[PDB]
Amino acid sequence: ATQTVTLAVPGMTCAACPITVKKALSKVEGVSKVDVGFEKREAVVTFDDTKASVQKLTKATADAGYPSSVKQ
Ligand SMILES: [Hg+2]
């Protein structure tokens, strides 16, 4: 119950929304670590699948308002 994947959130592309995706995986649930890229719409996060999951990661940014995807 501890996986780490990357995320593709083209929902935006500047110093403000992609970084929000970082706040999304950090607020997704079991996220244990996060490291994305602003304008480079790319979030790489680690977490505990016991309470979260690669799906919940793309869903956290998708919930921030940035319909993204995942590609561990
Ligand atoms: Hg932005």
UniProtKB/Swiss-Prot annotation:
The gene is merP. Involved in mercury resistance. Acts as a mercury scavenger that specifically binds to a mercuric ion in the periplasm and probably passes it to the cytoplasmic mercuric reductase MerA via the mercuric transport protein MerT. Residues 3-69 form the HMA domain. One of its GO terms (cellular component) is periplasmic space. It comes from Shigella flexneri. Monomer. GO terms for molecular function: mercury ion binding; mercury ion transmembrane transporter activity. The keyword Heme does not apply. Belongs to the MerP family. Its main location: periplasm. Coiled coil: none annotated. Keywords: Mercuric resistance, Mercury, Metal-binding, Periplasm, Plasmid, Signal, Transposable element. Hg(2+) binds at residues 14, 17. This is Mercuric transport protein periplasmic component. It comes from the Bacteria. It is found in: Periplasm. Disruption phenotype: Mutation decreases resistance to mercury. The keyword Metal-binding applies.
